[PDB]
């Protein structure tokens, strides 16, 4: 099965797994418990297969929204942090690791979209979405544009649509209501209507995808884009003097990007649940533990208040956390696959003009 007296940890190959092993070495140095950190291929789907056998790692690191399915299959142990520890993490991150009212993982890091802007073209980026049309008029007169971001993917257009009241599934008391969907309320209509109006008035092009936006910003052709921390490295090499800030408001309300919380779950089959709890609470989720991982591969914003306040000296990370706190936790239920397909069709249909915004959002709500 899973052998006792040691910890096996699975984490994806793009994370700082050697820094995590350094934290595992400190744990072993204090307790004699060997901690081995591996990054298998196809990790997201290998864990359910290997855990449902009774096998697998003791701890698995993944985006919170996948853990919902794990917990549904009874693959994750309910965790037992006390009030003092829970108070060390930002409260919204705990909401990301609830399934049917129960905590099933420890939040580690926090990720969301931000407003990325060219300081040379735009030293004072707009605070509101309603400012962009006039701003695009000015920059059109200089051979530039105000804003280009991926319109083909709902993940990128959702911050605007959700600003004035849209939502995927309503979250209440650690549970999602599958029957309360907020893609067709007045807030979503107002947001998508603005998106389409920006396209009609020639301020954005409806075919703009990831590649077009990324090259357009990194070549100095647009003053702003919308992207996440995974994108900063390409901008660094592009020699564009860029900043990262809070997304514009819409109708005075913050933009609501989806939030992904990298979290550590404990295998229900683990005979080392108490050792995992001790490692995760007393060694990893500390300033020293998160710093070891971050120095390997940057975590971005982190759920641990004390270390985030240090990381937030980087205003890009501060902006990521601000947009996360104002955002929508990505639901951890299987019906999100229907939400993606539905919202994707509606945005493409509304942005293409093949359908009005009202007609578009009525169809997305119905299946």
């Amino acid at each position, epitope marked *: 099965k899973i052998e006792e007296g040691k910890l096996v940890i699975w984490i994806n190959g793009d994370k700082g797994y050697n820094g995590l092993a350094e934290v595992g070495k400190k744990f072993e140095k204090d307790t004699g418990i060997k901690v081995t950190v591996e990054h298998p291929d196809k990790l*997201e789907e290998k864990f359910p297969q290997v855990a449902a056998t009774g096998d697998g790692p003791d701890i698995i690191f993944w985006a919170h929204d996948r853990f919902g399915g794990y917990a549904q299959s009874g693959l994750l142990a309910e965790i037992t942090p006390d009030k003092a520890f829970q108070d060390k993490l930002y409260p919204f991150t705990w909401d990301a690791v609830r399934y049917n009212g129960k905590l099933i993982a420890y939040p580690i890091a926090v990720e969301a979209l931000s407003l990325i802007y060219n300081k040379d073209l735009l030293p004072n980026p707009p605070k509101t979405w309603e400012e962009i049309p006039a701003l695009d008029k000015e920059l059109k007169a200089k051979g530039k544009s105000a804003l280009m971001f991926n319109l*083909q993917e709902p993940y990128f257009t959702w911050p605007l649509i959700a600003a004035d009241g849209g939502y995927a599934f309503k979250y209440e008391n650690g549970k999602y209501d599958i029957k309360d969907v907020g893609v067709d309320n007045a807030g979503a209509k107002a947001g998508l209507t603005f998106l389409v109006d920006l396209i009609k008035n020639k301020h954005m092009n409806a075919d703009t995808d990831y590649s077009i936006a990324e090259a357009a910003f990194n070549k100095g052709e647009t003053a702003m884009t919308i992207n*996440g921390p995974w994108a900063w490295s390409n901008i660094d090499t592009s020699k564009v003097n860029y900043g990262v800030t809070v997304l514009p408001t819409f109708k005075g309300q913050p933009s609501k990007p989806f939030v992904g919380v990298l979290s550590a779950g404990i295998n229900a089959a683990s005979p080392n649940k108490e050792l995992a709890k001790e490692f995760l609470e007393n060694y990893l989720l500390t300033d020293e533990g998160l710093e070891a991982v971050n120095k390997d591969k940057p975590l971005g914003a982190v759920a641990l208040k004390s270390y985030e306040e240090e990381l937030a000296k980087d205003p890009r990370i501060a902006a990521t956390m601000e947009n996360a706190q104002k955002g929508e936790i990505m639901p951890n239920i299987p019906q999100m696959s229907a939400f993606w397909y539905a919202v994707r069709t509606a945005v493409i249909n509304a942005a293409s003009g093949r359908q009005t915004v009202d007609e578009a959002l009525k169809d997305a709500q119905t299946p």
Partner: nanobody
Amino acid sequence: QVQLVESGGGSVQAGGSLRLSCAASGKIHEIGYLGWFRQAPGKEREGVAALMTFQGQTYYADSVKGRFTVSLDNAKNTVYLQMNSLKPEDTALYYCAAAYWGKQSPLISWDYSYWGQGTQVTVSA
């Protein structure tokens, strides 16, 4: 669980071509992204080609752009990698992958939740 069965592999000479296939089974309707990745002996896994399943947009690594084409037959639930003008550096284990949503460039592999078996395309000089 979305499942992928892989096929199409082979060993051919340079200047020849090959067509890889990858059959998708299950809840495959809501998929938004399909990609082909390869891993050379003892190297990193590399995005080769990706396809946004909705409006059919395509993305290609510089190494294969203009030589490879990714295509999806919806009526047959099968994504193809047409590999024209094969070079010896095309030798690698090739994987296909699927995802519902994507925050990143479609050519980045950590994006994708589902994966195939990995077949050894071999191209000799």
